[PDB]
Design a protein around this ligand. Structure first.
Ligand code: IT0
Ligand code: ZN
Ligand code: ZN
Length: 219
């Protein structure tokens, strides 16, 4: 019924994985994440919704000669963390911020075996960086910057045509968070959202526009 997991090259060493899941009210939801190759090693940027899809993602790169050295989840929702439990069972290092794992704990969900704190964190030095722009889609949402390619994975923060699920959003901080993100990564060549198509740096402007709009319509 749902479309199959999809793995497409985005740039040298950078793939987009897209998994699909029926959520009530949204219909069939695409979820983009990334796989990043650092030498012969693969790093998941977000997991698919499910264990099954996460395992297909892993064997796709293991088949091709890459070992999985780590995954990081950009916020606590299952569309970023759905495969952490499966990864933990395979001894694959999982990462999530302290707050993200805190929110997973409080939801009765399996946590990543590694955490980081602070606004900045290198998953792989000079290759894969994690940055927290402030609350928005969720209290814990973080973006992943790839400095050698100028690719920003915005996750569920980047929302150019609607803010999506507001269940855990902070609509009052989101505009300040988006404006900070827009100035910091304005030279990004590609911007990858969770649920919308890859774009250029204008997706940062549009995300700001939608967050300001969303704040005003709540008053
Ligand atoms: O990450 C989440 O919390 C999440 C979960 C499910 C859907 C989600 N989204 C929904 C939309 C708008 C939309 C409208 C119609 C079709 C597809 C998307 N954007 N994201 C989300 C989310 O907000 O990230
Ligand atoms: Zn979310
Ligand atoms: Zn999402």
């Amino acid at each position: 019924s749902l479309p199959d997991l999809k793995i497409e090259k985005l740039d040298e060493g950078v793939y987009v994985h897209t998994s699909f899941e029926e959520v009530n009210g949204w219909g069939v939801v695409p979820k983009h994440g990334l796989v990043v190759l650092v030498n012969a090693e693969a790093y998941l940027i977000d997991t698919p919704f499910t264990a099954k899809d996460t395992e297909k993602l892993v064997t796709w790169f293991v088949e091709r000669g890459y070992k999985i050295k780590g995954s990081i989840s950009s916020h606590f929702h299952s569309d970023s963390t759905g495969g952490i439990e499966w990864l933990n069972s395979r001894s694959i290092p999982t990462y999530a911020s302290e707050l993200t794992n805190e929110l997973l704990k409080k939801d009765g969900k399996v946590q990543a075996t590694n955490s980081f704190s602070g606004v900045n964190y290198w998953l792989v030095k000079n290759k894969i960086e994690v940055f927290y722009p402030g609350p928005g889609h969720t209290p814990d949402n973080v973006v992943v910057w790839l400095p050698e390619r100028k690719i920003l994975f915005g996750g569920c923060f980047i929302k150019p045509y609607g803010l999506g699920n507001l269940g855990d959003a902070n609509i009052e901080a989101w505009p300040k968070s988006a404006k900070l993100l827009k100035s910091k990564y304005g030279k990004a060549k590609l911007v990858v959202p969770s649920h919308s198509e890859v774009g250029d740096a204008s997706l940062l402007k549009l995300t700001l526009e939608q967050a300001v709009k969303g704040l005003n319509e709540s008053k």
